[PDB]
């Protein structure tokens, strides 16, 4: 009961927050129903907000106990820590906020629940430091008693009780007011007394050029120093830094200020010091793709009505052009590692139209570029526009590897969607040509590909990266000459190593070699060679990149003896896919080993083996361990209750790898009970258990399935119905 | 769920091998159709085997999938099963160490764990003594589970038919066979055989055995050909499936790795040229699937089929068919790739999408035919040809009929012949279309025995289209010749549909058969009204062993009746044909090594050979007292129908007589009946006079003869002049049909009949 308790719990902590929902007014309700939803039986017990408290604490502690903990038994490079950074800011930034406004300020039950803890979490940690690096050491429990101080929580004089016996901590040192403190041009640490006019005053005065040349932290601009100082930042004060950043943003997109809306993205896609994190950490995504995908899609009414006839059309058009492809670097980074999905919005807000979507189809297809070209994708039933289509191919390559100039007339007369396939057009076809031996000619191409870098044609640089790779795949493998081979990095490196960049377009270079940077690594190095490895590590190292093997980026003399691994999730042959299966049929049946309460190691070997082999080969082969062993836990082999909740465990855990909102569980009964809801779940077991419950139906009527076999089937389905009604999600 | 695309084989030459789930003791079975009475089917009694890893000296596992060597041309009869294991078992069937056996008796070769040699013929699990072997489960899939696998053929040439056509100008249906020239991967004749597996690790696997050598060896590679081990053992293909393609030595592994989420595509090239064969991998392509339709419904990837294509098609780019299912929505569409290099003033360009009203629950395409099958959830089959992706089964109704050439039929199905209800895919373990598309196997969950379900045809009774159906199944019987296969299940349609037609009017029913038969030698280029030349051809072709056999089975129902009654005594003569002709042969070439060979006497080999030329004389008597017999039941029935002439149930003495090869047939039989006794009497046994019992009794028999051969032989040499005249005052060719399968004069010659 208490067993079931506390691993109901975990998983539930660990799928919120998986799931962003932290943000949802609705956790402490939620998180109080808990205990009522999971005894079937009326469970009346007034429980007081200090228990509230005690309870998040002590269940927090040690979720986070069992995931730092479990990670010694994955393998040494499966490298997944967006969840790890994921835990570290629930844990400083929201539970503080939750006992500032849900707590009635009692330092008692505070020492009770950092008392109450085992000592094993403790021993853990500081083994695993230990190996990982005396040095400072400081725990995740220094952390959030420091956030209690700057809140008025608890006076100085609490932090050292919970101190080692040999060290104190000075009481004047420690910051206790939550004001905002920034460090002047002179040195002087100013009060920021107001937040969204400082962002908006140094927004307006912020230079693009000072994104990632401004190694020091020495910058006059204020806001650039808080990206790189954002791990010191007060507990209440940056959720009103984020809100900021949502309400300026929705008001630049109404009132179409293209110049704050391009300069707000850029801060936004480098990451520095895990900013864009905490970002998604606070805020919805969904809330944020919605806006985001908005001002990509309704920019075609924006073209209408102007003209360029005036002297800051030139400056209004690159304003327009760096706006635009500026908004596109972020959906990508989203989607790419932050593990977010641009087909879902679409289908879960019907103002968005999928079939006229621009956004939806360009993203799938990132890494492929069509052979042929073509001004619009729906009318290709019509021969008017191919006439013209291979007419601006013609203007476009003599007019930029010839006659040396861009014309006006061009830029104005071709939209920016049309710019961002004819780049890779031409790129591939100079590409190819030099590769076969068409082109010969180099030091004319590498000129020519300096007209790439203008700000009017920085959108085109999006694909132009991602199908190198495949490019470099194939050459990789084929026979190329020295002599060609020196050749193609030659004109690679001039996109690589620019020798002059516009103020406009020096971060955003950077910024696109950040999106595609680690495969491009893995295929360079099987191989002027070093330049192309010296500047793509550059970059690589600006920030911080999640899921990398550190050894990979600084393999330049260090020998560890052992084969790196670029992907998230690794296999050898001595730890084969068997291996930990059966290490999880021990744990899916046992629950041994140590994987469990890791969804990022079990969400990616579901999908590595799919749901159907994943539940194929586990529900037949527990019968066969039923039928031998008996269920745990107990010394008596009689009745079936025993064994009915051990069933519960799966089936649980099932159930919120399929839902992941509030509202959506209020649908998926209707589903049962029987279009717009399996379209989001395609992959979802709910899907695969109804479509099999209503097809062996069928065979009934016509009789080709013993009564037996039916009644077995339809037992696992109301099983699942009778959690997901009993249960609120 | 997937059902088991290859769980069942069924072999070229008759054999049903298929897996086993269900009994403890064994994992394989093996059956094969048999005729209970002529006139209907059962299938024969199943052949329990268990096989475990360790049979070259004990817990055994499940069988992954079965394939047959019947690709291309090979002879089809050794077998290699894989193992959930991974194991690679090859079982080879027709053979034994000592001595050759029947097509049910298997024999190893090799097992898989290493490699090693040991012979070793297998036996039945229910009668071998209960054994020690409980069915182990290996529910786990490792690194050398075989996804695919595939045989590689030799250096021979196929050569199969591609679509018929009515010409109607001569109202008749035209058919014309074109050669297929090897494409892809083929083994040398060096070589004994070689093939290929994928593990779903992506570890490649290539068996081959040296025809001058009993060692088996094995190279293995890997696909990712990465310089860190830990991206090597990453590969979990999720489907791995090799089609060959023109280029030389060349086959397209197409998968789809999960791990990237992309469809990635590999060349393998293998050079034969005794050193072991060299094996080369070269990566090529990768692109990414489309997430939604032009409407704005989301798309799944439910299976990933490519169609093995050869260079007779207009585009030799193999057809990569990925799934899509519209969710919540009864449609699925059929998107079609394929590859084609880039050109300069790889890629995978777009045809076109094809969407069906069904959701579809299995794929498998068949062999020779380019038909692709969509096993859908109600049922029903809807196969789509390779070359335009028209329905089979509606194709005729819109066929546009104008032109040079008019309805083209490529199979049976294009007629109408469509399946019953078909048991739902839920209750079903495995199904698949026969091998001529005219039945579906199914395999039931309850049923302890394979189940069968034929084709029906709604309109019956419409009389006129009796002419197109003949046609129809005549040329399914042409393609099936060409691929050397057994066809019983075609066999089994055509009697149906017979049957009902009988069941209304008997008379209408007799009309089908003659047509149906008659097609089969347009299409075949054989003419039986040709001249006496191309005659002796058709004695010795091997069709007549089945095409007479059709009718075999066509007419049992039919009691009282000739029909079969007269295939079976020119198929009895074949045999009897055999019997003298196949020894006189023999018999001539022992004359020249007695000469030879006499000048060592005394040598232990002359004894058994001087023992052994008058021991086969001697097994010939029981032949000839049936050869005896069998003319006397045709002059018996001659002093029977000159008192009746009208009794028709004795119509069967026309047609024997009026067949044309057999009364020349008979003259070769008794003028080498003469040249042996000739022989004989020239060259008599004298060393052993004992032995010449054999010899004597050869011409007692003869003289013996209630009928004297020489007035016999006289009567059919008499019978052949009189029907020669008679083709010169009239021409006619139905005539020669007549003669030879109706058994029966036309009622306008009915004045040839008073002359017998």
């Known amino acids: ?729 | 769920m997937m059902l088991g695309e290859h769980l069942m084989s069924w072999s070229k030459t008759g054999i049903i091998a298929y897996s086993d789930s269900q009994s403890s003791n064994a994992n394989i079975c093996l059956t094969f159709l048999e005729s209970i009475n002529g006139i209907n089917w059962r299938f024969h009694t199943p052949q329990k085997y268990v096989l475990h890893p360790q049979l070259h000296e004990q817990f055994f596992y499940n069988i992954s999938s079965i394939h047959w060597n019947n690709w291309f041309s090979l002879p089809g009869d050794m077998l290699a099963v894989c193992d959930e294991l991974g194991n690679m078992t090859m079982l080879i069937t027709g053979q034994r160490p000592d001595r050759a056996t029947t097509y049910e008796k298997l024999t190893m070769v090799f097992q898989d764990n290493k490699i090693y040699n040991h012979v070793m013929p297998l036996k039945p699990v229910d009668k071998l003594k209960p054994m020690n072997i409980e069915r182990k489960q290996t529910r786990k899939e490792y690194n050398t589970s075989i996804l695919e696998f595939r045989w590689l053929t030799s250096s021979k040439s196929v050569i199969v038919s591609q679509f018929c056509a009515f010409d109607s100008s001569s109202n008749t249906y035209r058919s014309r066979a074109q050669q297929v020239p090897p494409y892809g991967v083929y083994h040398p004749p060096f070589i004994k055989y070689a093939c290929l597996a994928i593990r779903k690790n992506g570890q490649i696997d290539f068996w081959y055995q040296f025809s001058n050598s009993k060692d088996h060896k094995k190279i293995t590679l890997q696909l990712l050909d990465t310089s860190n081990q830990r991206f090597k053992d990453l590969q979990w293909l999720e489907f791995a499936r090799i089609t060959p393609m023109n280029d030389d030595q060349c086959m397209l592994i197409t998968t789809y790795s999960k791990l990237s989420k992309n469809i990635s595509f590999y060349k393998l090239h293998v050079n034969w040229n005794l050193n072991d064969p060299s094996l080369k991998i070269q990566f090529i392509l990768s692109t990414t699937l489309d997430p939604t339709d032009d409407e704005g419904h989301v798309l799944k990837l439910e299976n990933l089929h490519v169609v093995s294509k050869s260079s007779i098609e207009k585009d030799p780019s193999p057809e990569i068919l990925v799934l899509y299912n519209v969710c919540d929505t009864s449609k699925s569409l059929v998107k079609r790739y394929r590859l084609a290099p880039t050109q300069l003033s790889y890629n995978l360009r777009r045809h076109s999408d094809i969407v069906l009203d069904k959701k579809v629950t299995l794929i498998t395409s068949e062999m020779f035919d380019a038909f692709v099958s969509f096993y859908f959830e109600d049922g029903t089959i809807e196969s789509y040809n390779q070359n335009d992706w028209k329905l089979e089964t509606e194709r005729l109704i819109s066929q546009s009929q104008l032109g040079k050439f008019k309805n083209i039929i490529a199979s049976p199905l294009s007629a109408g012949f469509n399946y019953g209800k078909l048991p739902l895919p839920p209750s079903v373990e495995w199904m698949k279309v026969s091998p001529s598309m005219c039945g579906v196997i199914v395999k039931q969950y309850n049923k302890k025995w394979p189940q069968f379900y034929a084709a029906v045809q709604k309109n019956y009774a419409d009389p006129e289209k009796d002419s197109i159906n003949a046609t129809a199944l005549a040329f399914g019987y042409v393609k099936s010749l060409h691929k050397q296969i057994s066809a019983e299940d075609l066999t089994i349609a055509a009697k149906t549909h017979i049957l009902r037609i009988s069941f209304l009017d008997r008379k209408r029913a007799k009309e089908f058969i003659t047509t149906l038969l008659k097609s089969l030698y347009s299409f075949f280029n054989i003419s039986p009204d040709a001249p006496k030349e191309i005659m002796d051809k058709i004695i010795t072709s091997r069709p007549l062993q089945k095409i007479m056999l059709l009718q075999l089975e066509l007419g049992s129902c039919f009691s009282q009746e000739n029909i079969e009654e007269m295939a079976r005594v020119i198929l009895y003569l074949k045999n009897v044909l055999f019997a003298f002709n196949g020894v006189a042969r023999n018999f001539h070439f022992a004359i020249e090594q007695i000469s030879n060979n006499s000048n060592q006497q005394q040598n232990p080999k002359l004894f058994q050979t001087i023992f052994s030329k008058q021991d086969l004389i001697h097994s010939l008597i029981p032949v000839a007292k049936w050869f005896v017999k069998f003319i006397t039941y045709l002059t018996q029935e001659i002093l029977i129908l000159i008192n009746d002439p009208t009794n028709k149930e004795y119509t069967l003495v026309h047609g024997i007589f009026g067949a044309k090869m057999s009364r020349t047939l008979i003259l070769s039989i008794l003028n080498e009946i003469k040249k042996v006794t000739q022989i004989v009497a020239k060259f008599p046994e004298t060393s052993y006079p004992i032995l010449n019992e054999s010899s004597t009794f050869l011409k007692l028999v003869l003289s013996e003869s209630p009928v004297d051969f020489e007035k016999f032989e006289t009567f059919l040499v008499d019978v052949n002049n009189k029907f020669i005249a008679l083709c010169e005052q009239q021409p006619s060719q139905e005539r020669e049909f007549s003669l030879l399968v109706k058994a029966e004069i036309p009622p306008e010659y009915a004045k040839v009949g008073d002359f017998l």
């Open chain 1, 1 to 729: 009961d208490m067993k079931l308790l506390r691993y109901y719990k975990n998983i539930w902590l660990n799928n919120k927050i998986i799931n962003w929902e932290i943000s949802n007014p609705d956790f402490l309700s939620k998180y109080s129903a808990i205990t009522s939803s999971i005894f079937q039986e009326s469970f009346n017990s007034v429980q007081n907000l200090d228990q509230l408290l005690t309870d998040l604490i002590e269940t927090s502690f040690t979720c986070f106990a069992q995931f730092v903990s479990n990670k010694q038994y994955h393998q040494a490079n499966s490298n997944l820590t967006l969840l790890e950074r994921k835990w570290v800011i629930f844990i400083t930034k929201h539970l503080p906020l939750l006992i500032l406004e849900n707590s009635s300020r009692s330092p008692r039950v505070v020492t009770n629940a950092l008392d109450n803890i085992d000592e094993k979490v403790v021993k853990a940690i500081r083994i695993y430091f230990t190996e990982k690096d005396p040095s400072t050491s400081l725990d995740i429990r220094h952390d959030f008693i420091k956030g209690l101080i700057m809140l008025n929580l608890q006076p100085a004089s609490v932090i050292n009780n919970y101190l080692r016996e040999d060290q104190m901590i000075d009481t004047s040192i420690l910051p206790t007011r939550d004001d905002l403190f920034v460090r002047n041009l002179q040195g002087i640490q100013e009060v920021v007394h107001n937040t969204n006019s400082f962002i908006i005053s140094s927004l307006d005065t912020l230079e693009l050029e000072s994104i990632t040349e401004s190694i020091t932290h020495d910058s006059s601009n204020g806001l650039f120093q808080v990206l790189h100082n954002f791990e010191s930042v007060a507990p209440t004060k940056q959720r009103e830094i984020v809100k900021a950043f949502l309400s300026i943003f929705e008001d630049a997109i109404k009132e179409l200020n293209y110049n704050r809306i391009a300069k707000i993205c850029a801060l936004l896609f480098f990451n520095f010091s895990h900013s864009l994190t905490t970002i998604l950490s606070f805020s919805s995504p969904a809330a944020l793709m919605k806006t985001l995908i908005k001002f990509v899609d309704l920019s075609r009414n924006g073209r209408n009505g102007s003209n360029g006839n005036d002297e800051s059309s030139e400056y209004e058009t690159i304003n327009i052009s760096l706006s635009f492809s500026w908004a596109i670097l972020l959906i990508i980074n989203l989607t790419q590692t932050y593990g977010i999905s641009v087909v879902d919005v679409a289908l879960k807000y019907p103002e968005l139209s999928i079939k006229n979507s621009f956004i939806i189809n360009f993203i799938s297809n990132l890494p492929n570029v069509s052979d042929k070209y073509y001004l619009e994708e729906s009318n290709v039933n019509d021969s008017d526009m191919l006439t013209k289509s291979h007419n601006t191919v013609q203007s476009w390559l003599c007019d930029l590897f010839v006659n040396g100039s861009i014309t006006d007339q061009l830029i104005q007369n071709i939209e920016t969607r049309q710019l961002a396939n004819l780049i890779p057009f031409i790129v591939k076809q100079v590409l190819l040509s030099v590769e076969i031996g068409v082109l010969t000619d180099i030091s004319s191409l590498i000129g020519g590909f300096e007209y790439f870098l203008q700000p009017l044609l920085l959108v085109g640089l999006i694909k132009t990266f991602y199908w190198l790779e495949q490019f470099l795949s194939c050459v990789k493998n084929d026979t190329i000459s020295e002599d060609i081979l020196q050749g193609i990095f030659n004109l690679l490196n001039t996109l690589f190593n620019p020798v002059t960049l516009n103020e406009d377009s020096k971060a955003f270079h950077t910024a696109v070699l950040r999106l595609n940077a680690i495969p491009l690594l893995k295929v360079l190095r099987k191989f002027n060679l070093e330049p192309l490895i010296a500047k793509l590590v550059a970059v690589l190292n600006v920030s911080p990149v999640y899921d990398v093997d550190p050894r990979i980026i600084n393999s330049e003399n260090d020998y560890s003896r052992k084969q790196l691994g670029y992907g998230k999730f690794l296999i050898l042959n001595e730890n084969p896919i068997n291996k930990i299966m059966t290490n999880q049929i021990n744990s899916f049946w046992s629950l041994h080993s140590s994987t469990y309460y890791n969804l990022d190691y079990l969400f990616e070997l579901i999908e590595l083996v799919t749901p159907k082999s994943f539940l194929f080969d586990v529900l037949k082969t527990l019968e066969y361990k039923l039928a031998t062993y008996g269920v745990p836990g107990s010394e008596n082999k009689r009745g079936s209750l025993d064994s009915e909740h051990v069933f519960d465990y799966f089936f649980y855990f099932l159930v919120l790898y399929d839902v992941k909102t509030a509202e959506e569980a209020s649908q998926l009964i209707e589903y049962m009970e029987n279009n717009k809801i399996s379209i989001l779940k395609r992959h979802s077991f709910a899907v695969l258990l109804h479509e099999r419950k209503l097809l062996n139906d069928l065979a009934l009527e016509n009789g080709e399935i013993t009564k037996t076999e039916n009644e077995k089937f339809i037992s696992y389905h109301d099983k699942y119905l009778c959690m997901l009604k009993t249960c609120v999600f």
